[PDB]
Design a protein around this ligand. Structure first.
Ligand SMILES: Nc1nc2c(ncn2[C@@H]2O[C@H](COP(=O)(O)OP(=O)(O)OP(=O)(O)O)[C@@H](O)[C@H]2O)c(=O)[nH]1
Ligand SMILES: [Mg+2]
Lengths: 180, 18, 177, 415
């Protein structure tokens, strides 16, 4: 066989990649997805179903599927586990009461044998009020250092400002793409 | 030609009724 | 067969997705219980192609009573499609919303029905009139709570003779029951 | 108020079904076939079946039974009209009505079924209009359906404006075995094949008896149509006011008006048949055909069907004009004539043997039917006056129409 076509495609870029979106509901996941795809703050209701899109940046077609954290929709996240390569976690630092529930849900989902090659990707959401913590307090509370065989990185993103998403995308690309 | 009666031209209205 | 179809439907190629949808439609028409693959087709639902959306909606309508629990993963797609610029897509979504015999599904569809009640498209008006009648037949109490009687009555006094006739027929059917 | 319209097959297999209300389980279609078999075997078969509290109304298509199940006291006439519209749409979209196309165009079939009717209420019935939104080889729905003019699509452009009309005559004669004609009705048919540019509004004017009487010209030959039914594009108000036939012609062949009135004139063909049937020995066919039509008119493709014996064999034909062929499939002798000039008189003498063994059961006496078709002949005498072709842009139209006289329910009771 010959792989000349593959080399020609890679000379201009052929890899696309994928990504997933999980976390607590009402955490700005829809707004973050809109900012990543379009770049505008559109008003959206609670994600009763789900939103799936693709992101084109750095010659990588990052497919993003926004998924809510509702009680009736939390168990439905297993449907997206099939043919999934990436995953992004949206944290709600302004919701102290739901922090324990989010941690338990992450532990339950993080204990899935199918999701093993996906590295950790946590978005520091709720970066609009002083009640938002730092990038180490949230990581310490979530116990991200205890995730063996998990490549986790903490990135703080503000939905209103749109800053911090580029750093997270670059970190995800570096973790997924191991080329120059 | 065509079976069933040849096509014939038709008018636009009753010219004799104004 | 079933595994190969599921693998094809779980792919990122539209050319194989269309063939898989056609095969699934043929199997159901041939008399094959394809309701076991209903959750698999749920992920491959939000598609830009109009041909596959109709097939997906038909499969969901035909596989709604069989798997009511798995139908909870279709409200978001219907809500998103209820505002499509293309009138045909909106009419198809309105028709599919009323065709789903789900008790917990018509509850969340009231907002799209209210939004489409004042739809400018006469075909959209007829589709909303049909959806309101279907919802009232499914749930008369839900229709009364939504207050769609006033909108249906006001439909007869508007333009679009076809939409007016559809609204009158829906009102007669509601009063018939 | 049918619950679901389905398409079945000759072996009981449902070619395609589409639920609209969901009030009836789809498994009731299985019991339709045994019920039909029992009704046919007991003579109680009817198009509208009834499985308990659910009625299974079905009609016999070319190859499948268009069964439409229902549960409530829905409009049976409305269901029949919807089925007829669906059949017309299928015939327009699919040139053949058989199992070869039912299983070949299901992708567009499902879309057409979904678009045609919703919740038991039909919504789309224009085949041309439906072809602009549903195709087998999608844009927004056309505004013509939303607009008042749903039978004349705007923006149509043609190099020429030629419309081919068709004055189709239907000669139905019911001559009893006693020699008297009981049912002699002639049904007119004004069908035009319009192919023009834009949305022309035809202004039809003919030699009607009522119109001539109203205008005061009730002294010449005017057709007094007992039943006059306009097409969909025909405006009922204009005809009701002063017999004003103003409507927007459709794009293609369509039936604008169809006259229907009784006839008090002599039959165009006088057929006298004789039966010298010996008691299990032989049979005689003293068939004499007299053409009562005008000598200037010729009946092309005349086929006078004469029913021969069911067990008859070894026939001998002694005729004068026209080929005679005995078709065992139809069990009758067709007095086939290529062209029959008016006033012609053809005499035939059939002679065949019969089996010695008598038949166990009777076979009946089917009526004798002819298949005469003489074009360019107007027996009713109704003459078209004018056709007001008006366009907003303005163009010179060249309408065309042909008058065809054929044989309809022209059956002759046997002796
Ligand atoms: N004030 C403020 N609120 C924010 C900001 N980012 C996210 N939110 C809140 O987060 C909520 C989530 O909105 P969306 O992103 O549209 O929806 P979602 O994150 O997918 O949540 P669900 O739809 O319920 O799954 C919004 O209602 C906002 O109130 C922000 O930057 N500033
Ligand atoms: Mg959301």
């Amino acid at each position: 066989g010959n792989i000349f076509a593959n080399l020609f495609k890679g000379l201009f870029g052929k890899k696309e990649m994928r990504i997933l979106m999980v976390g607590l509901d009402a955490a700005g996941k829809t707004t973050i997805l809109y900012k990543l795809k379009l770049g505008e703050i559109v008003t959206t209701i609670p994600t009763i179903g789900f939103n799936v899109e693709t992101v084109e940046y750095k010659n990588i077609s990052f497919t993003v599927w926004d998924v809510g954290g509702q009680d009736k929709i939390r168990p439905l996240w297993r449907h997206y586990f099939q043919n999934t390569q990436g995953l992004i976690f949206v944290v709600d630092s302004n919701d102290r009461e739901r922090v324990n529930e989010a941690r338990e849900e992450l532990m339950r989902m993080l204990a899935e044998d199918e999701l093993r090659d996906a590295v950790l990707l946590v978005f520091a959401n709720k970066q609009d009020l002083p009640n938002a913590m730092n990038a180490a307090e949230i990581t310490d509370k979530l116990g991200l250092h205890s995730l063996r065989h998990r490549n986790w990185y903490i990135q703080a993103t503000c939905a209103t400002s749109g800053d911090g998403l580029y750093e997270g995308l670059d970190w995800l690309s570096n973790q997924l793409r191991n080329q120059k | 030609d065509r079976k069933g009666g040849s096509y014939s031209q038709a008018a636009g209205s009753d010219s004799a009724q104004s | 067969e079933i595994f190969e179809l599921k693998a094809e439907l779980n792919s990122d190629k539209k050319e194989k997705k269309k063939e898989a949808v056609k095969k699934v439609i043929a199997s159901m028409t041939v008399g094959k219980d394809v309701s076991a693959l209903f959750p698999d087709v749920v992920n491959c639902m939000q598609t830009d192609n109009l041909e596959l959306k109709k097939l997906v909606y038909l499969y969901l309508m035909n596989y709604a009573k069989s798997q009511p629990d798995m139908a909870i993963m279709a409200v978001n797609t219907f809500v998103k499609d209820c505002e499509d610029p293309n009138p045909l897509i909106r009419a198809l979504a309105v028709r599919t919303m009323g065709c789903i015999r789900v008790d917990k599904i018509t509850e969340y569809l009231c907002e799209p029905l209210r939004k489409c009640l004042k739809d400018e498209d006469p075909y959209v008006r007829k589709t909303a009139a049909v959806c309101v009648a279907k919802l009232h037949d499914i749930n008369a109490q839900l229709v009364e709570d939504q207050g769609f009687l006033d909108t249906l009555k006001d439909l007869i006094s508007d333009s679009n003779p076809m939409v007016v006739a559809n609204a009158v027929a829906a009102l007669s059917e509601i009063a018939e029951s | 108020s049918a619950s679901a319209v389905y398409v079945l097959d000759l072996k009981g297999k449902v070619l395609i079904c589409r639920n609209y209300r969901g009030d009836v389980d789809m498994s009731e279609v299985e019991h339709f076939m045994p019920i039909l078999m029992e009704k046919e075997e007991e003579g109680m078969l009817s198009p509208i079946l009834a499985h308990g509290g659910v009625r299974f109304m079905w009609i016999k298509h070319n190859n499948l039974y268009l069964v439409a199940t229902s549960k409530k006291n829905a409009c049976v006439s409305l269901v029949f009209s919807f089925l007829y519209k669906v059949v017309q749409v299928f015939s327009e979209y699919f040139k053949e009505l058989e199992e070869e196309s039912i299983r070949d165009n299901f992708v567009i079939i499902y879309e057409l079924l979904d678009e045609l009717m919703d919740f038991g209420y039909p919504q789309t019935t224009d085949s041309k209009i439906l072809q602009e939104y549903i195709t087998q080889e999608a844009p927004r729905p056309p505004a013509t359906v939303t607009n008042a003019v749903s039978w004349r699509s705007e923006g149509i452009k043609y190099r020429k404006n030629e419309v081919f009309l068709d004055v189709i005559e239907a000669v139905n004669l019911l001559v009893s075995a006693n020699g008297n004609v009981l049912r002699s009705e002639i049904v007119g048919s004004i069908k035009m094949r319009v192919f023009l540019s834009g949305m022309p509004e035809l202004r039809l004017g003919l030699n009607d008896k009522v119109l001539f009487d109203n205008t005061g010209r009730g002294k010449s030959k005017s057709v007094e149509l007992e039943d006059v039914k306009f097409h969909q594009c025909v405006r009922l108000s204009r005809f009701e006011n002063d017999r004003t036939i103003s409507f927007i012609p459709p794009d293609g062949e369509f039936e604008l008006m169809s006259y229907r009135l009784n006839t008090h004139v002599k039959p165009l063909i006088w057929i006298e048949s004789v039966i010298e049937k010996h008691s299990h020995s032989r049979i005689e066919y003293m068939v004499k055909a007299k053409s009562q039509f005008k000598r200037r008119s010729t009946a092309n493709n005349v086929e006078i069907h004469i029913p021969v014996p069911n067990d008859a064999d070894s026939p001998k034909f002694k005729t004068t004009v026209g080929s005679v062929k005995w078709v065992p499939e139809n069990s009758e002798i067709v007095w086939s004539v290529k062209s029959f000039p008016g006033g012609k008189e053809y005499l035939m003498r059939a002679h065949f043997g019969l089996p010695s063994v008598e038949a166990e059961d009777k076979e009946g006496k089917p009526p004798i039917s002819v298949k005469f078709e003489i074009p360019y002949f107007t027996t009713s005498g109704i003459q078209v006056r004018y056709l007001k072709i008006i366009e907003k842009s303005g163009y010179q139209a060249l309408p065309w129409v042909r008058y065809i006289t054929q044989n309809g329910d022209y059956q002759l009771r046997t002796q």
